[PDB]
Design a protein around this nucleic acid. Structure first.
Length: 72
DNA sequence: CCGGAGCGTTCAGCGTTCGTTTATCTCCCCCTGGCACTGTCATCTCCGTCAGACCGTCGCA
């Protein structure tokens, strides 16, 4: 419940306004939003749990850590 | 051997006390009316439906 990101609410995308494209798993969700767990009721994909290693920008974008690779 | 006294019950004279009303006196509620320097145009809505149809509407042809 602490980690849930809720796409609904005031000033947000409502359930009647939801479509297939916004519910589905995007390739950019890797490390930023869990593709597995989400409420399986009427709001599939809209509410989703943050990833384990996810961090949040000051702006509000979700980061994820990667090890730098130099010269192989 | 009835006669009287005492006792049981049951009623007519006036004498007081109730049952139910009435207008007057405080406290409160409720509605209409007064305010006189000037003061003369608000308000945020609404977006990441949605899916296509039904329909009238409307300017171009």
């Amino acid at each position: 419940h602490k980690r849930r990101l809720n796409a609904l609410g005031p000033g947000g995308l409502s359930r009647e306004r939801a479509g297939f494209e916004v519910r589905d798993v995007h390739p950019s969700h890797y490390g930023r939003m869990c593709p597995i767990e989400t409420p399986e009721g009427p709001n599939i994909g809209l509410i989703g749990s943050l990833a384990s290693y996810g961090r949040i920008n000051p702006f509000g974008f979700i980061e994820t850590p990667y090890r730098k690779v130099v010269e192989g």
